[PDB]
Design a protein around this ligand. Structure first.
Ligand SMILES: *[B]([O])([O])C1=[C][C]=C(C(=O)N([C])[C][C])[C]=[C]1
Ligand SMILES: [Cl-]
Length: 355
């Protein structure tokens, strides 16, 4: 029965490579602290290099999980409080309208007036500052969730400002080593560029992520399948890790509000387990992802929970999910975007067949 792990992924994930012309895919599964690694296709079409345990993928919005873990690390260490405001750390924002939104509201996209991306005009560091200086409120603060890169991006910058280090160093020198990650980078070094996969757009043209405003805390992490399986293992068994990172992980497993059947935790999206397939798919619907939605208090606190998160760049797709009481998790990494529903459906079929 331990061999069906390899067989179940070939039935549900492998057909997606041909269906959407995906050059490479890496699917990992952890069950009872045992890791399974399945690699498909090529990380580089022109180089005919196959996807392996060293292939580096762009995590996209799954990077937000590491930003949330970084915030939980600073909160437990006393460097921040979720009730603090960004002006306390970014001094030029003090008394500005954005200084009325606390850090927890920035991390959970409830500022009331922040869209999915920065405007196209916002590029340089000065233009990022001018954006949050001129920021005016719209919806009542804390009442409307709108999935936003600027929101959690500012949250990550404040976390970095409270740790007296730039954000990329916070992850690479503190968070990643605390999680046991060996090849996770905000900036991929030259000695690892041969492992950095090419992404592929809808025309199957090789591409990689471009520099952008607050790109690192919003979508700037690149990682490998063994590292992401270690990150899942850390989320499944935080009590096995040192106290500083363990309490950081626990900070990301607490829902703060609901939107229909989705509980918004720190970075992670939380659901009552067992969850229906449509519940997980609804989290990635256009209504939940692109539009504002009024939030409600957590009424039913689920005793048995599950967590997932989709992430995408222009040429990469990502999906991670784990179930603590089943001690099972899955990671999908692809060097071409496939519909979010397809990633969730395939992982839903794999997890339910392994009890
Ligand atoms: B994500 O939720 O994986 C995500 C969506 C969009 C962006 C973005 O702003 N850009 C420009 C990259 C496509 C990042 C992450
Ligand atoms: Cl300042």
């Amino acid at each position: 029965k331990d061999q069906e792990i390899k067989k179940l992924v070939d039935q549900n994930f492998k057909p997606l490579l041909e269906k959407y012309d995906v050059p490479g895919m890496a699917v990992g599964v952890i069950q009872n602290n045992k890791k399974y690694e399945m690699y498909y296709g090529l990380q580089s079409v022109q180089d005919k290099k196959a996807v392996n345990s060293s292939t580096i993928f762009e995590l996209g919005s799954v990077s937000k999980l590491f930003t949330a873990t970084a915030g939980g690390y600073a909160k437990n260490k006393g460097k921040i409080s979720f009730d603090d405001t960004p002006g306390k750390y970014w001094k030029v924002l003090k008394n500005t309208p954005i200084d009325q939104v606390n850090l927890l509201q920035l991390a959970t996209y409830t500022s009331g007036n922040l869209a999915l991306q920065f405007p196209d005009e916002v590029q340089t560091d000065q233009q990022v500052l001018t954006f949050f200086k001129d920021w005016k409120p719209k919806n009542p603060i804390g009442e409307y969730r709108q999935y936003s890169n600027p929101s959690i991006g500012l949250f990550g910058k404040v976390v970095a400002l409270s740790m007296n280090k730039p954000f990329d160093q916070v992850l690479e020198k503190t968070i990643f080593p605390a999680l046991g990650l060996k090849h996770s980078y905000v900036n991929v070094p030259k000695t690892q560029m041969q492992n950095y996969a090419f992404g592929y757009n809808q025309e199957n043209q090789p591409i990689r992520v471009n520099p952008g405003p607050l790109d690192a805390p919003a979508y700037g992490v690149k990682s490998t399948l063994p590292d992401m399986l270690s990150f899942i293992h850390a989320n499944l068994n935080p009590q096995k890790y040192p106290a500083d990172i363990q309490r950081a992980i626990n900070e990301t497993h607490q829902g703060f509000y609901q939107v229909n059947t989705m509980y918004q935790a720190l970075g992670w999206e939380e659901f009552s387990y067992p969850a229906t397939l449509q519940t997980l798919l609804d989290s990635n619907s256009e209504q939940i992802v692109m539009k504002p939605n009024k939030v409600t208090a957590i009424s039913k606190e689920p005793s048995v929970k599950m967590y997932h998160k989709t992430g995408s760049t222009n040429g990469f797709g990502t999906y991670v999910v784990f179930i603590p009481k089943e001690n099972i998790g899955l990671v999908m990494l692809t060097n071409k975007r496939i519909p979010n529903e397809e990633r969730i459906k395939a992982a839903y079929a794999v997890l339910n067949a392994i009890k």
